[PDB]
């Protein structure tokens, strides 16, 4: 259906000098595509 | 229960090619990056090849640039590399090798997860690559 | 393209006494990269120092070093029966990472 997608990024954290992959589910309405043309790279709506 | 485990060695024609591969368990794949590194018998090590935990960064040491590639398929937990035009000085114990699990930005930044192949905590028992004629 | 050098290439020392390795790049290490392995025959590479100067998990402060610049070196306050291998220097400082030639210690 493609109503959702795993997505991973770099977050903040308790320390400013690090930062943690996360992985999580959004909903594809949630998300517009950055026009890379690759269709891998997205950003919040 | 941590280790890695090399295959596909085997002995291989000069000019020829072969595909080597990498199983591993008992950690995250995802989280690091990783390093094949070879040893001659009688010689000292040398760094072949590296991949980042996503494959978005490579990079080749000059003896073997622009002949060998590195991937990784992370699904399936296993690492690659496809050696082309192989030469006799190729000859070597081949070990693949876990990288760190953090890398650091030009800002001093630490991301954690994001691992590189700097330097390796890990290592494989290796195989073996033969070139002859 | 950089290249390290180890020296002395062969130590010879009786177990309990104190020896240090040197290494020397032949361009300067960013950000005291340089990181120390050991080896022995018939078994893989194992890391004593990630950095010039961290121990790795499960290294005991018997393995110690420290450095700037080209020039680093690796210290054991004592030798073990079980510390006679061969060592090398990494700089993990700029592509290609590289490995010194490295050095044997040796009591046979």
């Known amino acids: 259906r493609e109503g959702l997608k795993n997505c991973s990024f770099n977050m903040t954290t308790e320390l400013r000098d690090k930062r943690q992959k996360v992985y999580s589910l959004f909903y594809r309405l949630d998300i517009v595509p950055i026009n890379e043309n690759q269709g891998s790279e997205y950003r919040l709506i | 229960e941590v280790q890695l485990v090399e295959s596909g060695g085997g002995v291989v024609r000069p000019g020829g090619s072969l595909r080597l591969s990498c199983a591993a368990s008992?950690?995250?794949?995802?989280?690091?990056?990783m390093s094949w590194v070879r040893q001659a018998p009688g010689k000292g090590l040398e760094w072949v090849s590296g991949?980042?935990?996503?494959?978005?960064?490579?990079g080749y040491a000059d003896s073997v640039k622009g002949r060998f590639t590195i991937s990784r398929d992370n699904a399936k937990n296993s690492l690659y590399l496809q050696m082309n035009s192989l030469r006799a000085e190729d000859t070597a114990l081949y070990h693949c090798?876990?990288?760190?699990?953090?890398?650091?930005?030009?800002?001093?930044?630490?991301?954690?997860?994001?691992?590189?192949?700097?330097?390796?905590?890990?290592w494989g028992r290796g195989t073996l690559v033969t070139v002859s004629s | 393209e950089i290249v390290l050098t180890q020296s002395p290439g062969t130590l010879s020392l009786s177990p309990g006494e104190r020896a240090t390795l040197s290494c020397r790049a032949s361009?300067?290490?960013?950000?005291?990269?340089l990181a120390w392995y050991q080896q022995k025959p018939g078994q893989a590479p194992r890391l004593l120092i990630y950095?010039?100067?961290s121990r790795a998990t499960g290294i005991p402060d018997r393995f110690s070093g420290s450095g700037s610049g080209t020039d680093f070196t690796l210290t054991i306050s004592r030798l073990e029966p079980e510390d006679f291998a061969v060592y090398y220097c990494?700089?993990?400082?700029?592509?290609?990472?590289?490995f010194g030639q490295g050095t044997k210690v040796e009591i046979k």
């Open positions: 090798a876990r990288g760190t699990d953090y890398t650091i930005d030009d800002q001093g930044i630490h991301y954690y997860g994001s691992g590189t192949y700097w330097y390796f905590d890990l």
């Open positions: 008992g950690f995250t794949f995802d989280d690091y990056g």
């Open positions: 991949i980042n935990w996503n494959g978005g960064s490579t």
């Open positions: 361009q300067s290490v960013s950000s005291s990269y």
């Open positions: 950095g010039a100067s």
């Open positions: 990494q700089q993990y400082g700029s592509s290609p990472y590289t």
